[PDB]
């Protein structure tokens, strides 16, 4: 009643065509097949798919066999695992190489892997890496197969990553930290370190000590996109696993060794088009990078802290002192003409989280790094006692909040996204630079709308539309982003809105 038509093949023989009763034990089928070819000891054999990854057939997966499938009679997984336990440890180096090749093939099959793992097969591989001689020089091909088999076995999730010795860890890290070796070995070594880091806080700690920022970044400079992808993956893994209180230091260390420009020049603008898995790693890197802003975003100012109040005083001084009766008039209004809602105690405005102290950081950056722009914006609006001034303090806080929303500061990385904004790979302080560009935009839009204070939320909405219609054009640089914004003036936003209506 429940039948599947298959052909079963064996080297040197003609196929047997069977109508397999799915109620019959596989052992009965295999004995039939063996008898057909005069093979003794049917219990030594099993069936596997002839095509694809050639998986072993079990009483489970036999249900998936489609009519007309070609199967092969093969050595059973248990006997194959025992044979490879012997041969991967042969003193005959050709025997060992051949065995490791076969082990790398079979280890992807969980039916085989469980047999091999249950004889401490993984320890055969780790002991070889720990103590084998001339592995990189004389036996690099064998070593690549060894590492392939190791990673395939570990990927079945049967045993904990914490089983690995400090000696094995150090050897794998050694392959990464060395003036680059074989590409196959480096690829697998990076892959193993990534998996170790992701799966164990203990392994993360040991690995973080064994590899330098410089060594990791150097691997981004190879022309091989898979090496580059695993290098960024390992970097991402270290960031993901780093304690909250160490992640910022790590970012500064990578930044000082030019991680960003190396990615820009060797990946983003590289000869080889970026394929999906590299794109995904660039997405994760950008998510982790924006999340470095999250703590400050959620930090409230302490309005009773004189040092923090003094930062706002400094901000005001930089602008107001660039302006004498006029200057006096500004200061008599406390912080009103710097545009804070809380005129007398602007520190209170920085207790809103988001954006909290991040907004203060952005303002101080603009004032220290782009003083002329800062002064222009404040002074065009600090003597304005018609209701048309653009309030700097209030605007900057709301803009910082808006940028955090747009760029999704605080969002976790997930499996489904591969998107990133390439212009953030073009400047060490791209977030702060973006703030400066967007506060100039906000002031331009404000003036284009002849806005008053009552219009504040409407202007912010236009500015939000401007920014978010510019980003999907994927500007290559901050300058390109600026050019794009110029093509989205208030009058253009009006036209686009009308076209929707």
């Amino acid at each position: 009643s429940d039948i599947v038509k298959v052909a079963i093949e064996w080297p040197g023989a003609n196929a047997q065509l069977l109508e397999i009763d799915q109620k019959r034990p596989l052992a009965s089928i295999i004995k039939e097949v063996c008898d057909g070819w005069s093979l003794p000891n049917p219990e030594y054999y099993t069936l596997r798919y002839a095509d694809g990854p050639q998986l072993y057939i079990t009483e489970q997966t036999r249900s998936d066999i489609k009519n007309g499938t070609i199967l092969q009679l093969a050595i059973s997984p248990s006997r194959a695992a025992r044979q490879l336990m012997e041969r991967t440890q042969s003193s005959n180096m050709e025997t060992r190489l051949d065995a490791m090749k076969e082990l790398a093939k079979l280890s992807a099959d969980v039916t085989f892997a469980t047999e091999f793992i249950n004889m401490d097969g993984i320890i055969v591989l780790t002991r070889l890496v720990e103590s084998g001689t001339k592995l990189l020089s004389h036996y690099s091909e064998m070593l690549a197969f060894t590492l392939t088999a190791f990673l395939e076995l570990m990927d079945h999730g049967i045993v904990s990553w914490d089983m690995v010795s400090i000696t094995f860890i150090k050897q794998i890290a050694g392959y990464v930290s060395q003036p680059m070796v074989d590409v196959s070995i480096l690829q697998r070594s990076l892959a193993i370190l990534e998996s170790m880091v992701l799966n164990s806080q203990s392994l993360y700690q040991k690995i973080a000590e064994e590899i330098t920022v410089g060594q990791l970044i150097s691997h981004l400079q190879v022309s091989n996109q898979e090496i580059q992808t695993y290098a960024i993956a390992l970097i991402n893994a270290l960031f993901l696993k780093a304690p909250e209180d160490k992640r910022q230091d790590m970012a500064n260390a990578f930044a000082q060794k030019h991680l960003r420009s190396i990615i820009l020049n060797h990946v983003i603008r590289g000869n080889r088009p970026i394929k999906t898995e590299m794109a995904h790693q660039l997405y994760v890197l950008q998510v982790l990078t924006f999340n470095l802003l999250e703590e400050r975003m959620m930090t409230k100012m302490d309005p009773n802290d004189q040092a923090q109040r003094d930062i706002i005083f400094e901000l005001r001084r930089i602008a107001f002192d660039a302006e004498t009766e006029k200057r006096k008039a500004m200061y008599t209004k406390d912080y009103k003409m710097l545009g804070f809602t809380n005129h007398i105690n602007p520190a209170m405005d920085f207790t809103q989280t988001p954006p909290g102290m991040l907004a203060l950081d952005n303002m101080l950056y603009l004032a220290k790094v782009h003083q002329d722009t800062y002064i222009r914006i404040v002074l065009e609006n600090s003597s304005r006692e018609d209701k048309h001034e653009c309030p700097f303090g209030r605007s900057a806080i709301e803009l910082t909040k808006m940028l955090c929303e747009i760029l999704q500061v605080g969002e976790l990385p997930n499996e489904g996204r591969n998107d990133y904004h390439p212009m953030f790979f073009t400047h060490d302080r791209a977030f702060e630079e973006l703030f400066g560009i967007c506060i100039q935009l906000l002031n331009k839009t404000w003036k284009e709308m002849r806005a008053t204070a009552e219009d504040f939320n409407k202007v912010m909405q236009v500015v939000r539309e401007q920014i978010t219609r510019a980003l999907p054009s994927k500007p290559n640089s901050l300058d390109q982003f600026k050019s794009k914004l110029r093509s989205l003036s208030y009058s253009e936003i009006l036209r686009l809105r009308q076209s929707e209506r």
């Binding site: 990673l151 990927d155 992701l198």
Partner: peptide
């Protein structure tokens, strides 16, 4: 303080398994 990343399925988010499969053909 705890890590904001402590609770996620790191291999799944990182596509670790898929990348191995790509590498091992």
């Amino acid at each position: 303080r705890k890590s904001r990343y402590a609770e996620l399925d790191f291999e799944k988010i990182m596509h670790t398994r898929k990348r191995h499969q790509d590498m091992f053909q």
